[PDB]
Symmetry: D2
Subunit: 264 residues, 4 copies
């Protein structure tokens, strides 16, 4: 069923688990993620973003995202990740994304506030929540508080020692930063990128207030193992294996983040 | 735009070309086919059937098929292939397929007629065309049976068995063409030679179902991209499907025919 | 269920009945007509046209029309009446009308053909049928006209346009006879109000397969409005729906389309 | 455009206006209300409920409600009024109502909580707001009811059904509760008393049968006219009455 990310991130915060965010841009990725969330009885976020528009017609594929979200027996949030403009996130909303992210973190602090608040002020009247982002430079607790209070954003992606994407040496999460940002900010905390982080450290960060974690690369890599294994098989067989591989990886992330069982 | 297969198969029959029927069951196959038909300014048929339901949720993927069909600038027919029950083709129709095949070709002549006519009599009042099959694709079509079959069922088009298989006997096509006037359909045309396809079209084949060849084109891209990032591999699959669909559209003579 | 007017007008022709075309432009009119068709087990045509766009938002109301047509257990055709332009009938198609009339009958013969054929050539590739109209194109002297559709002109018109059905200007049964003999498509009657029951039945026996109801539902509704003018609005509007049902049932039965959906 | 009643009730609360809720169950009622809201540049609530399901096919009419709500240039909330069961409001939600009322006010306090909480607990994970009703409403029961149910707004009994309002009830409930207050059964309350009630915290007012009454005046005025004209006059009468309520309640201009 189409789910509200405010309710579910609140639940995750309060019960000390995190919701997995999966970027899905084709049929097998979408089906594999929904298979995992049904099997685990877990809320889940399915996301599209501008990085996939060269691969897949969002305006058409969104119909399949929304249909599967509606028909699922578990909570499914349809999300637009890393929104680069008002028109892009408006187009996401008109095509049935019920959760949006406006990423203005590349801009100076005041311009990040202005652009984020613009999105909030447009979408709150429509009932649509807006995730924002504020950027080793750790997120500062007092700046995070000011940012959230001033924008009215519904969730905040933070820098806690995690790498947004690729890493050199093992990221070291600063758990004191997590605690202090959690205490300063009234909305749920989000991580964009958790690669290279140990299971024990992910679990600690979740226990201290991380309520949503974006999986950016791992489904693609899990899929490619199935592609490579099945490169001499019929296409139909290869795609059945790609779906299963995606399901297995999504299930691993759901169990690691503690969201299994939380739908019921 | 959602298009009427009766209009387009008539056009094809009268102008001596064939409409390509492509089996699509995931995002890249669908997108690649639509890419080809847009580029070639061609009518096209996009098809799903029971052989794909283990791979893809038709009830959800149908929304993407219908969306792309409606928004395309070329004629797109949404077709349910090899329908072995009223229930499955009724499900297809409620999910936006605007052309149906009722395939009762596994049965004896009388029972094929009764089952086919059942589908025709349900769907014609709803404006939905029904393709039928006489011959199993093995059992070759008999021309005198064909005349009677089309007359009794009222089917809109007839899939024939002329050596085509999911050898090739052009005498059979020739005799069937003189026994019935409805458009003729060729299943299992992946791996028939270019010259034999042109011959079949000149003798009255007006729709040609391509299944395996898109799967083959995809797997070529897979083997060429097996060490690549998944996003890139999938762009290459879509591109490979487009190029193979384009090849078939031009072979069949449907390029340009949308204008 | 959304139904094909070609199939049903062919059925009507071959079994010597006519399908009722009801103009509906609000909720109680739509619901009464569907109530009638369901009770009578009859195909029915529900129509909107330009004459109502100032009363009701077509683009919004169309959604209720299509929904009711889909969910009905009887055949329901969604039809755009008297289409005055390609833009108007295109707008009708994108809002779920599955049957169109392109009415170019006010123009000279060749211009009627050109405008009608334009609609047919656009909409046949999309599977959408087009009803056309040909009135009296007079070969007679101006003096004799002081003292109506020609069958030969009708055959040329249908052949050149490819239209799926033809509205004809006819009470004069010769004209119905001669046009029926000359054209291969179903015949349609507009402006039948006040034709006697007996003559309607004769027109249908001779080849009329669809009959457009004019203001009869409107008048049926206003009898209920008058009767309920001191009642609460919810009660009044229920009686309007019932009055529309009753008038619609009367036409369906007169036309012989009751039972024809089975 | 389809609007969130929580946002708009919050706006009304903070700016001391109320949003009109209009019960609409046919084409002319819906169009006249949307006409008024557009002309006044006002948020509006359009509502259906069980009382109208025999007259009008909700499952079909809902498509026209939703289409008009989406296309409107002003905020339009699609609301199911006086929801009598989980099944009924679930059906409302599946046909595009984005705001629900669960009315368990027939029942004593504990049972009203339980039934209301059942609705909140089902619909909040779907992002759907639930209005409830309690009731004079007692301010301590109001605070406890809101806290225990998690409902998003509360319909209160202040002397509404010559109706004399107790304004002290509105003030004390406003102060005890953190959600917006709603008034049902406003008929016959004076303009001055409505304004006073809004000033003290009433943020949404349900228009009971005043559109129906306006429509019937058009009916009596047009009994000898053709149906197309009568219906133009009904739509115009609805528009006029809805505009009068929007202006009384102060929501004119609040959409921009
Ligand atoms: Cl600010
Ligand atoms: Cl038979
Ligand atoms: Zn980011
Ligand atoms: Zn086949
Ligand atoms: Zn007429
Ligand atoms: Zn006319
Ligand atoms: Zn109440």
């Amino acid at each position: 069923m189409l789910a509200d990310i405010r309710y579910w991130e609140n639940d995750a915060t309060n019960k000390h688990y995190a919701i997995a965010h999966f970027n899905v841009w084709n049929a097998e990725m979408l089906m594999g993620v929904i298979d995992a969330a049904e099997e685990a009885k877990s809320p889940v976020i399915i996301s599209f973003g501008t990085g996939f528009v060269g691969n897949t017609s969002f305006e058409d594929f969104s119909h399949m995202m929304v249909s599967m979200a509606q028909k699922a027996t578990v909570p499914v949030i349809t999300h637009w990740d890393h929104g680069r403009s008002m028109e892009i996130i408006h187009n996401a909303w008109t095509h049935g994304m019920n959760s949006l992210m406006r990423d203005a973190s590349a801009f100076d602090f005041e311009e990040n506030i202005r652009l984020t608040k613009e999105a909030v002020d447009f979408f709150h009247p429509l009932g649509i929540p807006v995730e924002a982002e504020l950027g080793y430079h750790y997120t500062d607790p007092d700046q995070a508080a000011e940012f959230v209070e001033r924008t009215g954003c519904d969730s905040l992606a933070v820098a806690i020692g995690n790498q947004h994407g690729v890493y050199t040496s093992e990221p070291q999460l600063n758990f004191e930063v997590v605690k202090r940002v959690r205490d300063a900010v009234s909305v749920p905390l989000v991580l964009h990128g958790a690669s290279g982080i140990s299971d024990a450290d992910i679990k600690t960060a979740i226990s201290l207030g991380i309520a949503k974690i974006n999986i950016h690369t791992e489904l693609c890599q899990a899929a490619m193992v199935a592609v490579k294994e099945n490169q001499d098989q019929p296409f139909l067989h290869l795609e059945r294996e790609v779906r299963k591989a995606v399901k297995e990886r999504a299930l691993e992330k759901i169990k690691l983040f503690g969201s299994d069982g939380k739908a019921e």
